[PDB]
Design a protein around this nucleic acid. Structure first.
Ligand SMILES: [Mg+2]
Ligand SMILES: [Mg+2]
Lengths: 104, 189, 68, 55, 145, 57, 143, 75, 144, 57
RNA sequence: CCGAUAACGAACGAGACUCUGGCAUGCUAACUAGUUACGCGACCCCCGAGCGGUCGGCGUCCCCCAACUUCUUAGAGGGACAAGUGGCGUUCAGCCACCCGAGAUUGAGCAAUAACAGGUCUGUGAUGCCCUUAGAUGUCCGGGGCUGCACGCGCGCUACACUGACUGGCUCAGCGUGUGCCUACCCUACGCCGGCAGGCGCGGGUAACCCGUUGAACCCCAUUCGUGAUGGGGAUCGGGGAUUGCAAUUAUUCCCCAUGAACGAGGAAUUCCCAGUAAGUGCGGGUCAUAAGCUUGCGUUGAUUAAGUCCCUGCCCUUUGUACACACCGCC
């Protein structure tokens, strides 16, 4: 065996993130695994407001850099063993994966 | 019928001049339970007319820094004051308000850029919409100034300001500045 | 005020109206679906500005000889 | 001097404890998110790091 | 009952070496004594078990002398040690509380104590400048011009 | 500097591009600094599309 | 016609229970009640002599609404505004020994007990009293 | 117009004036009686609720800031 | 006699303050946050919350039981959220369970008195810019 | 766990590594026609691609 | 942009673009989000209600042991275009009002040719030239200084009070952060001690999992005060106690008890501003071992006036005059 895996994907761009979510859950349907839906966690936005000038002379202009971090949770819960059935990651650069057992 | 503040039916009040009949909002369409509505009254020109005048006085009564957002306090002062003028005159408080508004709005003024003798140069009669706006502001300033450093509270000082304005005794600050503006306009004809 | 159509929206409408006169009507919603398959418009906000002008020109071409 | 006083004075905290990872300067440090990067160097490497100007 | 003024009403009392207005509240009249604040006044009357809602002038004379001796003797009437002024005296270490011109000459005594040893605080008190280390670039100019 | 910039600009246009711009700034000729700019083809400067339509070095 | 404390006026309820605790002299009251300030950010001691019965009445009303609140959560509930003199105003929590002792006395009155996790909640007897006082204050308000 | 020096406590010459002519006009509030009888105003709030207990004066508003009273109905 | 599954959940929002009204077929009972409608903090503004029941009568609320929850916003924005939520829940209740002839004759009264009871106010806030202390106010400038 | 670092600081450090590597490849391979760097990172191991015009040097 | 048109074909900028806000009871989902339904509790009822009411009390991903996505989250999509009507307009470009509509002008980012002897060599292993280089202008260490005060100016905070202050109760937010390569320095629930600042042990959280339903402030509801430099104001100053650091004196910060100074709405002038705006009001981040009167963002309450003009200060286009071209701060 009985297995249950929590899979999380954390990236920066929605373009590759929706692609890696779609095809990973698409292979599971061909493998007849029971899959929980994509849990779109709230976005972590890293905001930094730094003065544009490197000297300190001017009209007090600031620069606002925003970094977007998006996380999805996908549960692969088949009644039988799961690990040997899915040993392929098929990932692309820009998205970070993490495999978690049900105990962890 | 709408029972503003729970009482004071608005179907008996009336405006005694047609120039302000269509710009005061005491009518049944603009008869409201409470003078508190965020109806976006500054989105476009000629939209403060349909705003209820009881709400308009509440808006103008918060000024002088310490009171710029507090509307719950302003509504409760208006609630106290309208009950007070009802206790002191025996008629509808709204009828007192309409009498005060008409009798406070100056009907003429003066404004130029060229050489001016005393204040301004040329006399110009005012609009009905400016009549109401100047009336409410003059009443609010009269109440505030009288109540600034005396033991009488805002509800009482606002009460005697509108009561003296409804009758007319040259004691209301609104009618006092009204007569001053009319005299200056007459000189600047 | 501030609703004048630029060269891109106007010229695209003039190109596609007279080439696809048979496929166009006077409805904003109908014409905006026509422009999708006959014109690769990268932005939705561009295509419904174009189609709104497409109906406007169609209302004139139904009466008189437009320059198109 | 010798080994006992060349670096004896404590620098476990404060501005003098922290220097920039690029320009080695002790001013304008952006320590947020563990950047430890210069105020101006951050503007230089923002695009390559992943921070972008959205608004 | 909001009755008329008592016959034995002192419009201005005289406690220690200062007068206190009887036309105000009792807890806000004894604040006029040097050394007594609003917090000190509002706990000594609690420990004297006197009515707060009555004004200062209608206090009976035996109550008044009772309040004086309670405030003059704080250490023996359950007043906390963290409530005094001259806690841990520089002279003798005892925890006292002074409420008269003796406060003024204790301030003078501490002043000449700082001046005699001529500490940094003592010297700046001699010159009339600040002592708590604040800036003198722009402020404090009212007393100079 | 004038000849080298022409060779680089022609090399970029020959390899296939919509446009190219090169700016050389510094102490050219005399003591006082100058900035010589050489632009050809199409070159936008504003908005979002500049992020993925030009390469800047 | 069952009556809940959630169905009455909270200001009238907190006053009614305060007098209830005043008349039943089982509340453990410390020796510095007349001296200390209820909050670090409050300049003066409260006017009412029975302010401890006021705090106990208030916190018993809050424990009915939600539990698990310790000293830190309670002092935030009673927090307010600190003027700081010339500095701009800030938010400062109230006294900790005040909130701790008020809850401590409630174990003696057998109406608040601790949880398996942190914080404390009401006993079934306390839930009985907190709604019984609600019933009498609802009938008094009605008639 | 320099200082009010109002009456913190009553005297006989003003207490009777409170008892006979104050509950006779339409609008009685602690501010109005304080300025009319030159009493303080804290004494005004206390005395008004004393007349409330005597029942010869009717309360209407009862607010922390604006508490309003009135004379009894005649007729 | 005991017909279940007659429930409509309709929410109304105003200035970041969200309130969801759970309407059900039951006796006359109006409660928000588990408290009665009259037992609410802004007693000065209670007439605003009593406006929806005043404009339509208690007969329309007789077979209606509403339980409202508020999970964000401010004091009066809570009021403006709830008063829109109750009316929107009522008209949706009449829209799905009875004929919309009754829905029209209850909707036209609310829309003519205050359209905020049916359409939420779209304005929320604005962002402070780095030229001043506020969204539009700029810092005091000096020349000498 | 506490051994692992938070995602907020992890993605920042990833940008730190990419910028540091890009600068180093620029300085070391300046005359070599270095163009850019791409990182293909997996938990088992990472891989670095040096986009360059003249690979024989 | 339409139209004329010695021009035609173009290019950049503007627009378009990206992000953000507002409607989607439409779709995908959610035990790190909840809502209904059901079953246990716990209490108030009991005259009896009984599907009565309430609970952030517990359960139904403690996988066969509920459903659902409205509320919450975030992706895919729609939706708004001068689209419809009337008037105006060369009836073209477009303009005005209105119905229906969530919205008929949401705010920002980016932002052209050319230029300034504008600012930065004190951001850099960016750097030319000059200077110093061992009694160093390198570097380290100790102390002081950058704080210093007859005075002037600038940005702000606090107030001058009763639309208030004090005391008690009530009762609602959203950004965002939180344990570290070097690098030592985290965010803190709960229990106990103390009056407070604080201390001691259990823990949790590398985080929609814990802090945290961020029980914020303002405001609201009651008390006292009562037109006085008063219970407004807390400046200056004494004594005492803790925390951070190796070091607190020139007081780091915080607490308590003491004093209660000017200040009664401020001349000439002058700043900013049009709708969720000003203003009131607090909360995060940056700085930080210690810390905000600074700044950067967030949230609550929420208006008055105006939908115009070139009068003042300026800007753009055309014509015009010029003895100006370092360009009227010119020339003479
Ligand atoms: Mg006093
Ligand atoms: Mg643009």
């Amino acid at each position: 065996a009985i297995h249950r895996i929590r899979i999380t994907l954390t990236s920066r761009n929605v373009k590759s993130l929706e692609k890696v979510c779609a095809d990973l859950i698409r292979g599971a349907k061909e493998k007849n695994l029971k899959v929980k839906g994509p849990v779109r966690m709230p976005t972590k936005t890293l905001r930094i407001t730094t003065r544009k000038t490197p000297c300190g002379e001017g009209s007090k202009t600031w620069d606002r850099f925003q970094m977007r971090i998006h996380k999805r949770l996908i549960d692969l819960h088949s009644p039988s063993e799961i690990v040997k059935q899915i040993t392929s990651i098929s990932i692309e650069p820009g998205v970070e994966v993490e495999v978690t057992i049900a105990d962890a | 019928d709408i029972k503003l503040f729970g009482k004071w039916s608005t179907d008996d009040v009336q405006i005694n001049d047609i120039s302000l009949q269509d710009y005061i909002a005491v009518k049944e369409k603009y008869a409201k339970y409470l003078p508190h509505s965020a109806g976006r009254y500054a989105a476009k020109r000629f939209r403060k007319a349909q705003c209820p005048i009881v709400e308009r006085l509440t808006n103008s009564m918060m000024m002088h820094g310490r009171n710029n957002g507090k509307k719950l306090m302003t509504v409760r002062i208006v609630k106290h004051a309208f009950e007070i003028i009802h206790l002191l005159t025996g008629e509808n408080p709204l009828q007192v308000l309409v009498n005060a508004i008409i009798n406070s709005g100056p009907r003429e003024d003066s404004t130029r850029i060229g050489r001016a003798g005393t204040v301004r140069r040329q006399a110009v009669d005012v609009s009905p919409l400016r009549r109401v706006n100047q009336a409410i502001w003059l009443l609010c300033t009269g109440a505030r100034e009288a109540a600034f450093r005396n033991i009488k509270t805002i509800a009482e000082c606002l009460a005697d300001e509108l009561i003296n304005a409804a009758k007319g005794s040259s004691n209301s600050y609104a009618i006092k500045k009204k007569d001053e503006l009319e005299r200056v306009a007459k000189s600047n004809r | 005020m501030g609703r004048v159509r630029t060269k891109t929206v106007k010229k695209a409408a003039r190109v596609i109206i007279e080439k696809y006169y048979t496929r166009l009507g006077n409805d904003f919603h109908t014409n905006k679906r026509v422009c999708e398959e006959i014109a690769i418009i990268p932005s939705k906000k561009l295509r419904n500005k174009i189609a709104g002008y497409v109906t406007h020109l169609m209302k004139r071409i139904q009466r008189g000889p437009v320059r198109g | 001097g010798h080994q006992q006083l060349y670096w004896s004075h404590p620098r476990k905290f404060g501005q003098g404890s922290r220097s920039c990872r690029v320009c080695s300067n002790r001013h304008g440090l952006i320590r947020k998110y563990g950047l430890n990067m210069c105020r101006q160097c951050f503007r230089q490497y923002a695009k390559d790091i992943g921070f972008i100007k959205l608004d | 009952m909001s009755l008329v003024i008592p016959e034995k009403f002192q419009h201005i009392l005289r406690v220690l070496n200062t007068n206190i207005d009887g036309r105000r509240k009792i807890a806000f009249a004894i604040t006029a004594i040097k050394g007594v604040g609003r917090r000190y006044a509002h706990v000594v009357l609690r420990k004297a078990d006197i009515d707060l809602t009555k004004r200062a002038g209608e206090l009976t004379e035996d109550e008044v002398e009772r309040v004086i001796t309670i405030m003059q003797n704080p250490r023996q009437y359950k007043i906390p040690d963290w409530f005094l002024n001259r806690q841990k005296d520089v002279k003798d270490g005892k925890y006292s509380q002074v409420l008269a011109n003796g406060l003024d000459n204790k301030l003078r005594e501490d002043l000449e104590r700082l001046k005699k040893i001529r500490a940094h605080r003592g010297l700046r008190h001699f010159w009339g400048l600040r002592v708590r280390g604040q800036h003198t670039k722009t402020t404090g100019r009212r007393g100079r011009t | 500097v004038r000849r080298a910039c022409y060779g680089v600009l022609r090399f970029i246009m020959e390899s296939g591009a919509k446009g190219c711009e090169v700016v050389v700034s510094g102490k050219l000729r005399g003591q006082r600094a100058k900035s010589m700019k050489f632009v050809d083809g199409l070159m936008i400067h504003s908005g979002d599309p500049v992020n993925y339509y030009v390469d800047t070095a | 016609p069952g009556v809940t404390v959630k169905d009455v006026n909270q200001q009238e309820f907190v006053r009614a229970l305060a007098a209830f605790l005043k008349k039943s002299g089982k509340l453990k009251v410390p020796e510095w009640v007349d001296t200390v300030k209820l909050a670090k950010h409050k300049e003066l001691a409260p006017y009412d002599e029975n302010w401890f019965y006021t705090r106990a009445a208030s916190t018993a009303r809050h424990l009915y609404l939600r539990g698990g609140a310790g000293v830190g959560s309670m002092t935030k509930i009673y927090g307010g505004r600190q003027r700081n003199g010339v500095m701009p105003s800030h938010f400062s929590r109230g006294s900790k020994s005040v909130a701790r002792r008020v809850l401590q006395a409630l174990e003696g009155l057998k109406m608040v007990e601790k949880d398996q996790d942190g914080g404390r909640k009401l006993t079934p007897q306390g839930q009985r009293d907190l709604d019984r006082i609600a019933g009498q204050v609802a009938a008094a308000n009605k008639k | 117009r320099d200082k009010l020096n109002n009456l913190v406590l009553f005297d006989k010459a003003t207490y009777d004036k409170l008892c006979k002519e104050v509950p006779n006009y339409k609008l009685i509030t602690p501010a109005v009686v304080s300025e009319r009888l030159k009493i303080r105003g804290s004494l005004a709030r206390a005395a008004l609720q004393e007349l409330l207990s005597k029942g010869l004066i009717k309360l209407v508003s009862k607010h922390r800031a604006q508490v309003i009273y009135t004379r009894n109905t005649k007729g | 006699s005991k017909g279940p599954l007659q429930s409509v959940q309709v929410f109304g929002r105003k200035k970041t303050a969200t309130a969801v009204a759970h309407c059900k077929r039951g006796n006359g009972l109006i409660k928000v946050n588990g408290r009665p409608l009259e037992m609410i903090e802004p007693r000065t503004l209670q007439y605003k919350l009593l406006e929806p029941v005043l404009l339509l009568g208690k007969e329309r609320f007789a077979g209606v039981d509403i339980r409202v929850r508020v999970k964000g916003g401010g004091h009066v924005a809570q009021i403006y959220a709830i008063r829109q939520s109750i009316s929107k829940a009522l008209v949706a209740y009449y829209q799905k369970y009875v004929d919309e002839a009754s829905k029209k004759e209850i909707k036209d009264i609310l829309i003519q008195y205050d359209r905020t009871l049916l359409v939420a106010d779209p304005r929320r806030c604005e962002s402070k810019k780095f030229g001043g202390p506020g969204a539009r106010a700029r810092y005091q400038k000096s020349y000498r | 766990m506490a051994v692992q670092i938070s995602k907020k600081r992890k993605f920042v450090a990833d940008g730190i590594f990419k910028a540091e590597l890009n600068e180093f490849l620029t300085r070391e391979l300046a005359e070599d026609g270095y163009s850019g760097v791409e990182v293909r990172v997996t938990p088992t191991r990472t891989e670095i691609i040096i986009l360059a015009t003249r690979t024989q040097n």
